[PDB]
Design a protein around this ligand. Structure first.
Ligand SMILES: [Mg+2]
Ligand SMILES: [Mg+2]
Ligand SMILES: [Mg+2]
Ligand SMILES: [Mg+2]
Ligand SMILES: [Mg+2]
Ligand SMILES: [Mg+2]
Ligand SMILES: [Mg+2]
Ligand SMILES: [Mg+2]
Ligand SMILES: [Mg+2]
Ligand SMILES: [Mg+2]
Ligand SMILES: [Mg+2]
Ligand SMILES: [Mg+2]
Ligand SMILES: [Mg+2]
Ligand SMILES: [Mg+2]
Ligand SMILES: [Mg+2]
Ligand SMILES: [Mg+2]
Ligand SMILES: [Mg+2]
Ligand SMILES: [Mg+2]
Ligand SMILES: [Mg+2]
Ligand SMILES: [Mg+2]
Ligand SMILES: [Mg+2]
Ligand SMILES: [Mg+2]
Ligand SMILES: [Mg+2]
Ligand SMILES: [Mg+2]
Ligand SMILES: [Mg+2]
Ligand SMILES: [Mg+2]
Ligand SMILES: [Mg+2]
Ligand SMILES: [Mg+2]
Ligand SMILES: [Mg+2]
Ligand SMILES: [Mg+2]
Ligand SMILES: [Mg+2]
Ligand SMILES: [Mg+2]
Ligand SMILES: [Mg+2]
Ligand SMILES: [Mg+2]
Ligand SMILES: [Mg+2]
Ligand SMILES: [Mg+2]
Ligand SMILES: [Mg+2]
Ligand SMILES: [Mg+2]
Ligand SMILES: [Mg+2]
Ligand SMILES: [Mg+2]
Ligand SMILES: [Mg+2]
Ligand SMILES: [Mg+2]
Ligand SMILES: [Mg+2]
Ligand SMILES: [Mg+2]
Ligand SMILES: [Mg+2]
Lengths: 143, 58, 206, 171, 98
RNA sequence: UGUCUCAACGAGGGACUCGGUGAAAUUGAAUUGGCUGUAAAGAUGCGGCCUACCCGUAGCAGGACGAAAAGACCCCGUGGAG
RNA sequence: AGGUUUGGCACCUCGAUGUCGGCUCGUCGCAUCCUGGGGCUGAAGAAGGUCCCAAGGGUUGGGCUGUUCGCCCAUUAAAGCGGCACGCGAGCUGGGUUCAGAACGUCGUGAGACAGUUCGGUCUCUAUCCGCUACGGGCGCAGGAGAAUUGAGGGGAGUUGCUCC
RNA sequence: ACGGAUAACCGCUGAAAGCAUCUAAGCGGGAAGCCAGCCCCAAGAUGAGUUCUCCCACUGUUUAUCAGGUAAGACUCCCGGA
């Protein structure tokens, strides 16, 4: 008998990232995209929101992390793959840094991959999705 | 039901821990967690339940 | 940088101050500028140059209007050259200077499905002392259960030849400009009558 | 490594943020500054001090004081290290804005000084690097010393002019 | 939003049958009167035992048996299967109350 | 002297394509990836993470503790036989 | 510390997990044989010693022996040490040890035995799945078509001597 | 080759610790190694990208509701191919 909403709603949102610790902005984006906020209604449905991260280049990385953080990736080849990038090599492509954090804090299933579709990252303070006029968010909740 | 209930609780600046306890402190409401959800489909009420839990807690 | 298109004509014997020189003859027939790629319009700088002519009876309407917007006769072949900004049309004239080193790109002669000895220089097994692994036949591909797959990128029987190929820093022996002939030292990839690109030596010497 | 700053007559200072720009007789300069402390009043001599008798502070106390000190010592006075080529046939030349090292390598050596730093030589066997920033003149002179460190056995190389150097016994 | 919550329910859905654990109240004889933890019977509602000062009567409608089920138990490697039929009774109650 | 450095070219008979006839061993069922970890101690099948569109054809033999013979070694049976 | 030796223990495998060496094919560690960079030296130069960083690539051909090793010849920048079921027999050898024949030495009255030594002695045409190399068919990529293309990402390559200034 | 960031290491500026100190803030130098540069592959990068050009608004009553004649353009077939 529990209510099961239909979801005509699309919900655009514009999160700034300058100075926010990466994991923290990550968790806020992952929560807002997975549902959570608002009564979650069905886990079955991707009823979360579209996030539009901007200034992703400016993310703070408090502590030694800026050059300690070694993102690692493995090419099929059994020649040694496992290439690694410093995160100070967010200069190569800062959106990847953001997009990696978020996808970690999302489900890993069919629906989760489908969720990664709802993240849009732009390292600069600009974006092309003006047509959806996203609502601004803040960054942290209060007791 | 828990997910939806503290989703609504955070819509007003509370949270499941806080809202459920404050409702418990208010002459024990004893609504089921099922029932508190549905009042998260009827927002004007869940709102007053939030103000009531916020009371028995100040 | 500098670039042009031509057909591979063949290799012969030559002399320059009593040094016998093998040479490949190439026809760097005049090329036309069909398209100009600005970055401001196509995101990067390049030029689309054409080569072997063909009669408009064989040229379908879309390609016809392509060539037509640029004012050029239809060409069986088109290619881009990065960073070129030529003018008029790209003749081999002066574009290469005698004695330059140049990057010659062509297409390996297609050798079909070669074994391991031909393809990767395996040097398979002994021809006596007692096998049925005489010919190619690689020995092992793995090591028991240890990862228990065979490695990705393993060398194996396959399609040999037919590759793109570049050979860098061949020397420009001679230029018969009016014939549109360019004489280059040494070998070039692919069979006679084939397409080849000559471009400015990409790894210019110090 | 603390104490009051001195203010020569041809100087100015601004206490905004951690910014600290000076406009002394040889030109303007700036010294980066931790903002956890506040930059002090310019009324005559100036000193900044640590909020806490804590360990981590007084280190920055001394570093910040001495840094502003040397910045003033430069903008008001100037800076200039001396250097002495030493060893058979070692010498240098000035060629435009660059130094012409000529000391025991098959290739004569050149050095172009980063901005604001002036090479000079009078005696062909002696260099002098003048400038405004002290860290800059330090790294420049350290480069010219890098071109050849004096050898342990015989003392060939770049020297400080006043630089005594003991030497190993050879045979 | 009416709520058979748990065993005795307290929510505003005026006028309809619904199923409950049972009663003993034969036929329609029950006319069971109900507590009330909160219902919106006129937009307005309350909980603070002011709901208890309200009550909703309900006619009983009829007793019934739920759908059949088979309890099934199994554990690996030890033989041990168990098949057993079950279905739980209920009382259907119409609502009318304040 | 092709055994070899060190393999080449050529021949025929297969292998490949089309039309005719058409088996076999094997097969708990299968919608049957990589790393690392854990598990009765060598994981497609458990955990985490990565990678990966559907389906074939020609080929290679690392895995499927691949197939074949209820280990011939070893021990055991108050077993057997020469 | 490591887990490459001999071992302990006996945990899966005795309705079978083929074992030495060679060949073939590779790939990984680094506790580095060569090359590259450094400190110190009882480092003048040259030639070295030893420790620190470093795993890109490289690391020869023969005689003897089944050998692995090891000794030797003649070179070399160097002629590294280990893992991968002491990697690799549905990939090959089958020289070695674990079947039947036969002989010597030895032991046993014998039948027979071995720490041994010696000559001889069947290595199973068809790949289902996964993994790999090559090659197509389908659909997708918000109209249907012909061409030119950015490069997210991925692979290959990566050694070294000698002489001369 | 050039270039960027690094290892051991070598230094500048320098407090704590009125001297000293390469480090505690900061900065430069520094390898066959790392990233880029060279060659090859690559948008099934389902996040499927970009550019030039071509063809264009056809037809069928509530009955067959999507299909059918065609355009641009391919494909079958034929003769051949480093
Ligand atoms: Mg061919
Ligand atoms: Mg051979
Ligand atoms: Mg095997
Ligand atoms: Mg595996
Ligand atoms: Mg079970
Ligand atoms: Mg049991
Ligand atoms: Mg043949
Ligand atoms: Mg599958
Ligand atoms: Mg474990
Ligand atoms: Mg495992
Ligand atoms: Mg499962
Ligand atoms: Mg798994
Ligand atoms: Mg895919
Ligand atoms: Mg086979
Ligand atoms: Mg078996
Ligand atoms: Mg048995
Ligand atoms: Mg008996
Ligand atoms: Mg052991
Ligand atoms: Mg036991
Ligand atoms: Mg079995
Ligand atoms: Mg054995
Ligand atoms: Mg080491
Ligand atoms: Mg050395
Ligand atoms: Mg020496
Ligand atoms: Mg040898
Ligand atoms: Mg002999
Ligand atoms: Mg090895
Ligand atoms: Mg062993
Ligand atoms: Mg083995
Ligand atoms: Mg076999
Ligand atoms: Mg034998
Ligand atoms: Mg006797
Ligand atoms: Mg015989
Ligand atoms: Mg034999
Ligand atoms: Mg056959
Ligand atoms: Mg289109
Ligand atoms: Mg790339
Ligand atoms: Mg991919
Ligand atoms: Mg110092
Ligand atoms: Mg540094
Ligand atoms: Mg540097
Ligand atoms: Mg080199
Ligand atoms: Mg799409
Ligand atoms: Mg249609
Ligand atoms: Mg037509």
């Amino acid at each position: 008998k529990t209510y099961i909403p239909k979801n005509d709603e699309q919900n655009w949102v514009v999160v700034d990232a300058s100075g926010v610790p990466l994991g923290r902005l990550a968790t806020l984006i992952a929560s807002r995209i997975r549902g959570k906020h608002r009564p979650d209604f069905t886990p079955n449905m991707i009823q979360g929101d579209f996030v539009v991260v901007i200034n992703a280049a400016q993310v703070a990385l408090t502590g030694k992390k800026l050059d300690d953080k070694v993102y690692t990736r493995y090419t099929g080849y059994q020649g040694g793959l496992k290439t690694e990038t410093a995160r100070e090599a967010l200069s190569k492509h800062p959106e990847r840094v953001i997009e990696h954090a978020v996808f970690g804090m999302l489900p890993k299933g069919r629906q989760g991959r489908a969720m990664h579709t709802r993240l849009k990252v732009y390292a600069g303070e600009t974006h092309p999705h003006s047509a959806q006029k996203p609502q601004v968010l803040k960054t942290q909740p209060l007791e | 039901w828990i997910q939806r209930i503290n989703a609504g609780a955070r819509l007003h600046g509370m949270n499941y821990s806080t809202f459920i306890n404050g409702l418990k402190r208010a002459n024990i409401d004893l609504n089921r967690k099922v029932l508190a959800d549905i009042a998260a489909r009827e927002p004007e009420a869940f709102k007053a339940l939030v103000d009531a839990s916020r009371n028995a807690r100040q | 940088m500098k670039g042009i298109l031509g057909t591979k004509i063949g290799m012969t014997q030559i002399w320059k101050n009593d040094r016998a020189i093998p040479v490949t003859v190439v026809l760097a027939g005049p090329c036309p500028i069909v398209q100009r790629k600005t970055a401001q319009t196509d995101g990067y700088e390049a030029v689309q140059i054409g080569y072997a002519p063909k009669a408009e009876r064989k040229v379908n309407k879309p390609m016809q209007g392509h060539f037509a917007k640029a004012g050029v006769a239809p060409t069986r072949i088109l290619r881009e050259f990065r960073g070129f900004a030529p003018d008029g049309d790209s003749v081999n004239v002066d574009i290469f200077a005698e004695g330059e080193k140049i990057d010659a790109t062509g297409t390996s002669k297609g050798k079909g499905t070669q074994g391991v000895m031909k393809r990767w220089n395996f040097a398979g097994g002994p021809a006596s002392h007692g096998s049925k692994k005489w010919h190619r036949r690689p020995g092992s591909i793995g090591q028991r259960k240890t990862p228990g797959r065979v490695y990705k990128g393993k060398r194996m029987a396959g399609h040999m030849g037919m590759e793109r190929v570049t050979v860098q820093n061949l020397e420009v022996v001679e230029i018969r400009a009016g014939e549109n002939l360019i004489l280059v030292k040494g070998a070039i990839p692919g069979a006679n009558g084939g397409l080849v690109v000559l471009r400015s030596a990409a790894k210019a010497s110090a | 490594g603390k104490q009051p700053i001195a203010v020569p007559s041809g100087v100015t200072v601004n206490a905004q943020d951690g910014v600290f720009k000076v406009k002394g007789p040889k030109g303007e300069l700036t010294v980066p500054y931790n903002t956890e402390l506040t930059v002090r009043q310019d009324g005559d001599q100036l000193l900044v001090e640590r909020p806490s008798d804590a360990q981590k502070h007084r280190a920055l106390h001394g570093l910040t004081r001495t840094l502003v000190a040397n910045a003033v010592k430069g903008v008001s006075d100037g800076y200039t290290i001396n250097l002495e080529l030493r060893g058979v046939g070692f010498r240098a030349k000035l060629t435009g804005k660059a130094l012409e090292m000529n000391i025991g390598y098959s290739h004569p050596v050149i050095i172009e000084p980063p901005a604001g730093v002036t090479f000079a030589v009078p005696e062909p066997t002696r260099i002098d690097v003048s400038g405004i920033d002290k860290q800059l003149v330090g790294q420049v002179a350290a480069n010219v010393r890098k071109v050849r460190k004096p050898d342990a056995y015989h003392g060939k190389g770049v020297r400080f002019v006043g630089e005594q150097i003991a030497l190993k016994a050879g045979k | 939003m009416f709520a058979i919550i748990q065993t005795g329910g307290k929510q505003y859905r005026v006028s309809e049958g619904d199923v409950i654990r049972v009663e003993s109240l034969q036929g329609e004889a029950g006319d069971k009167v109900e507590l009330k933890a909160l219902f919106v019977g006129g937009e307005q509602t309350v909980f603070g035992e002011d709901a208890g000062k309200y009550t909703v009567q309900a006619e009983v409608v009829e007793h019934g048996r739920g759908k059949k089920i088979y309890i099934r138990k199994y554990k690996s490697g030890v033989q041990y299967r168990r098949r057993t039929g079950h279905r739980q009774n209920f009382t259907a109650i119409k609502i009318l109350g304040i």
